[PDB]
Design a protein around this nucleic acid. Structure first.
Lengths: 454, 313, 50
DNA sequence: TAATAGATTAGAGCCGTCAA
RNA sequence: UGACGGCUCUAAUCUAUUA
């Protein structure tokens, strides 16, 4: 007989001061926070890729309906939602011949063909950005179903090699936008989106609007003076050793006005294999970088810093953290895990445990159900029984209830997708994506450090 | 006191806190006053009506207790013994083959059993003394009151975990269960036969889909955090005939994914409860072996969880 | 802090450094999409920067 | 410099997302 | 690179002990 506490669902702030809980409903009811005028689409690829992009873009002008609009809200249309003109008349097309892909695909090696394909694509994009007068806001790279299949590394290297030019790029697969046509040898769509077409339109439109300089939404309930972080460790494989720990971080204050969320980036390296920990000098450098980023933007150092991680800290890096941390700044190192196999079953039958139930084990440890039944959409976010996140304050002092509330608040800022909520604080997810991109090509000085470029 | 006097006595609709809530209020008033409205399109303008209700919340506030996969540990044997087999224990001798679980240490043997409980395996230990073996109580080491330089309390807890896991592995050998070796754990599942070809208190434990048979499997692991418990994980395995498994990871993964496509919370909970009730030695628990006279009894009911906020259909 | 030095190359270099560093930081790590940048220089910078 | 176990990690691959 | 969830499998590291 144990007890479960409950924490209220956070609200995200939309246009003209309107809050809500679902991103899709809030967008369809009030629209994005900011106002763009239009999106100038640059397209790079084959002629049939241009045709697919054009017909999909003209497809998402008109409203799209789901099989059950309660679980998946309908998409009213791009100009209806985002009040921006993302129309087929703004396309600037660069032609990549199928024969070039023929030479660069049918070789024997895998690294060399990936490098050749990336060289071709980024070279066309770089030339079009450098020595042309047409302006492109987002470059869409429509690849056939022979690159993402036979060369999957291509995406990571492609995004890593464009970082020196700050080109917002959106990769697409021909089957993604031509799922109706892209049937199998049996004549059946392997990617049947008939009942969830509006969901795909929501995701694509929100990603494109975000990469084009727009801010669709932001969380409304987060206190000032607290800066959140997320550190993730990746293995680099192209080096001499099998793996060397590479730490990359994402960063999030609140703002002067609203939702500063950039990512304290610039990878740090520990050569010892398996030691997912920071040496004192690297921890000092990272903490100083984040603190200076806060200081230059607001003018005073934050009073609370909530460092997240998927690993446990050791004492050396923690004391280094305190060494560089000022005396007036609180430091709370939290750890978030998933491998603990706890499961709560509903005794009443079909539907699963409601999302938001917290099993506060003690002052410094609790379980949180960030994924589960949501009463508003009337559906569980998983298929099997969801597994909670084991959130335990590893170092420092802070309320466990407040920590759980902040973790449930930071699971809504997934601009890469249009869903109700994520199953992990988005800071860690975006730090993971940044590290994955950065550890693909080992030549980037002062990485761009903005999420639209990743 | 600043609203003009010509509208104060009129009822007002609140819009300051939200516009969707105010819109819902407007719609309620309009429907209750029967205001004309038409042009119901084939594109279902009722969906927009559904969405502009803002939406509901968890105001129902039921209790709706929940169960788990956690078995509470109760009635722990009072102490564990270290047997100083200084030169009595032969070197290059593993400990797994012992019918009675133990862990090798520096020179001793760590177990809940008494000294002469391994007479068959090591008959030379007949003349073993009692002053050699040192006894550590269990009820106080769990609370963290123990501290020594001979052994660390955390290492003792890890040793207890090892003993419990060894006992759990041993107890399924004679329980007529079939074991499967996964990536890092062993899963124990019942076979065809013993039931009415499928049942346990009315729960289909082994079934058959389109072509082959699917079996429900349980994996277990002992822990002491937050408190001494036994954790259970569920699995779905596939056999072509029922007596022979498929030695392919990809086929098994595909079949497991397809079978779990339709299962829901009630199915998982009932199957877990039936499987765990099967292993019962008595009416309300089941015991694991650590001593000739000392047993570790485990509750056969999962640790229930209680909430105060819930939902409905 | 830069305009009141002695050498003309040094003050020009420091001023251009300030402006272009702010612009490059804004370009690299801000989520906006600025189409054209407009540099409003007071009538005390270009007066003595040639 | 190989053996156990526990505990902690990351990475790669693959299927479901509907109404039946 | 449309996006999430869930499993499976493969590896390494840190604690202790023993060869």
């Amino acid at each position: 007989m144990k007890e479960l506490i409950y924490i209220e669902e956070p609200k995200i702030l939309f246009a003209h001061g309107q809050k809500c809980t679902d991103a899709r409903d809030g967008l369809a009811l009030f629209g994005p926070l900011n106002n763009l005028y239009g999106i100038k689409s640059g397209v790079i690829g084959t002629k049939q890729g241009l045709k697919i992009f054009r017909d999909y873009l003209d497809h998402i002008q008109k409203p799209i309906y789901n099989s059950n609009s309660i679980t998946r809200p309908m998409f009213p249309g791009f100009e209806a939602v985002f009040d921006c003109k993302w129309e087929s008349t703004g396309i600037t097309f660069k032609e990549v011949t199928n024969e070039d892909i023929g030479k660069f695909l049918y070789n024997s090696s895998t690294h060399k063909r990936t490098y050749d394909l990336v060289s071709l694509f980024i070279d066309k994009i770089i030339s079009a950005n450098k020595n042309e007068d047409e302006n492109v806001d987002v470059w869409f790279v429509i690849v056939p179903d022979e690159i993402y299949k036979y060369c999957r590394q291509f995406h990571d290297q492609f995004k890593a090699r464009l970082l020196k030019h700050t080109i917002p790029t959106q990769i697409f697969r021909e089957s993604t936008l031509a799922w109706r046509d892209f049937k199998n040898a049996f004549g059946l769509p392997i990617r049947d989106f008939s009942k969830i077409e509006g969901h795909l339109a929501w995701t694509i439109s929100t990603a494109a609007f975000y990469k084009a300089g727009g801010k669709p939404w932001k969380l409304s309930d987060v206190r000032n003076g607290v800066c959140y972080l997320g550190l993730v460790y990746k293995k680099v494989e192209k080096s001499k050793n099998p793996r060397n720990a590479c730490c990359a971080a994402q960063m999030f204050l609140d703002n002067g006005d609203g939702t500063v969320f950039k990512g304290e980036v610039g990878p740090w390296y520990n050569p010892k294999n398996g030691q997912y920990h920071l040496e004192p000098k690297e921890a000092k450098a990272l903490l100083s970088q984040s603190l200076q980023s806060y200081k230059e933007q607001i003018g005073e150092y934050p009073k609370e810093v909530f460092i997240h991680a998927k690993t446990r800290f050791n004492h050396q890096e923690w004391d280094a953290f305190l060494e560089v941390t000022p005396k007036e700044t609180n430091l709370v190192g939290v750890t978030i895990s998933k491998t603990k196999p706890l499961k709560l079953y509903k005794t009443e039958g079909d539907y699963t445990i409601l999302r938001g139930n917290a099993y506060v084990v003690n002052e410094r440890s609790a379980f949180l159900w960030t994924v589960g039944y949501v009463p508003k959409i009337q559906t569980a976010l998983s298929m099997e029984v969801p597994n909670p996140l084991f959130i335990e304050i590893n170092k420092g002092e802070a309320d466990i209830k407040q920590v759980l509330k902040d973790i449930l608040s930071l699971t809504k800022l997934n601009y890469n997708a249009c869903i109700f909520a994520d199953g992990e604080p988005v800071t860690l997810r975006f730090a993971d994506k940044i590290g994955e991109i950065l550890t693909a090509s080992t030549d980037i000085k002062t990485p761009p450090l903005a999420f639209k470029y990743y | 006191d600043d609203i003009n006097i010509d509208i104060v006595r009129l009822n007002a609709i609140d819009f300051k806190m939200s516009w969707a809530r105010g819109l819902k209020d407007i719609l309620e008033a309009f429907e209750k006053q029967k205001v004309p409205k038409e042009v119901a399109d084939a594109s279902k303008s009722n969906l927009l009506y559904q969405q502009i209700f803002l939406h509901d919340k968890s105001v129902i506030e039921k209790e709706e207790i929940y169960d788990s996969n956690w078995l509470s540990i109760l009635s722990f044997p009072e102490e564990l013994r270290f047997h100083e087999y200084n030169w009595m224990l032969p070197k290059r001798f593993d400990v797994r083959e012992l019918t009675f679980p133990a862990v090798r240490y520096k020179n001793y043997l760590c177990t809940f059993a008494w000294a002469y409980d391994f007479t068959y395996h090591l008959p030379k230990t007949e003349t073993y003394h009692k002053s050699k073996t040192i006894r550590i109580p269990t009820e106080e080491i769990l609370s963290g009151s123990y501290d020594s330089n001979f052994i660390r309390n955390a290492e003792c807890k890890r040793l207890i975990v090892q003993l419990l896991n060894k006992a759990f592995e041993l107890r399924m050998k004679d329980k007529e269960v079939q074991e499967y070796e996964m990536s890092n754990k062993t899963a124990y599942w019942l076979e065809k036969g013993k039931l009415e070809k499928d049942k346990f208190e009315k729960t289909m434990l082994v079934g058959k889909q389109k072509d082959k048979n699917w079996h429900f499997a349980i994996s277990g692991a002992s822990k002491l955090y937050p408190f001494p418990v036994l954790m259970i994980s569920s699995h779905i395995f596939f056999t072509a005939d029922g007596k022979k498994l498929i030695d392919s990871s990809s086929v098994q993964h595909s079949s497991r994914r397809r079978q779990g496509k339709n299962w829901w919370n009630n199915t998982w909970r009932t199957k877990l409860l039936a499987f765990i009730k099967y292993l019962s030695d008595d009416d309300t628990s089941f015991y694991l072996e650590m001593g000739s006279e000392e047993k570790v009894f485990v509750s056969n009911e999962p640790v229930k969880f209680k909430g105060n906020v819930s939902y409905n259909i």
